[PDB]
Design a protein that fits this description.
This protein is mainly alpha-helical. Helix content is 49%, strand content 6%. The longest helix is centred in the last third of the chain and has 18 residues.
Length: 270
Amino acid sequence: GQTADWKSIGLYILSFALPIILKALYMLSTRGRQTIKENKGTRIRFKDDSSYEEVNGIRKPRHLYVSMPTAQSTMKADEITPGRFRTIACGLFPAQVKARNIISPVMGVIGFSFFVKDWMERIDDFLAARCPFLPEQKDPRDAALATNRAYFITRQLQVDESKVSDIEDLIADARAESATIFADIATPHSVWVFACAPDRCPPTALYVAGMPELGAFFAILQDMRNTIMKSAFYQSYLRRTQSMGIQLDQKIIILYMSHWGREAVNHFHL
């Protein structure tokens, strides 16, 4: 795409009660090829006791709808598709995703489960590492200035110039519907925005340094696994994410791969 109005889709989804989102998200991730093929209608209907609305005083059911996959064609900007849903849902409630251990098999088969096992320690070890393309420092007491942490700071400042209203809008609204969003990659749920295998970076994680790239890392693992087992995960993720108005910093992916890829391959499923 490119033309998806995430603010409205983000609002729509944020007007629902957690469990019916959680219900939807779970199904659409771990049985996407399933529920889609068996759904009677131009829409997929999610229902749960937790979502209701009062129609003039009476508690009436409030289902949540996801329009079926239209191969582009009739694609409104505010149309909520399974792909479009999984992508934003994920970025919004990674804590909950974590809590209910929601892992799409698409990510499970590249070891996602083990990867996230000690996430903080992992990301904190990584940020602590010396960064290949920073200079060493004359003053030994200035060694932080050469760490990966330091490179991400320069990245934070870069993406900040490249921000769109629509998505900032969405982060704003997200944050006092108390979405479990986050500002830094070194936080305990961050990696979990990819557990459900979005097709692109979750909009609410798009301006947190290194997050979009973390996605492509997972995408690239997916291609390796496919190579070992003609796939195009990374390309699709690249195109689709960068459509959101941000260029990937090809260097951060390279730092991820080099640090984590040896051990990742050992935990694939083949």
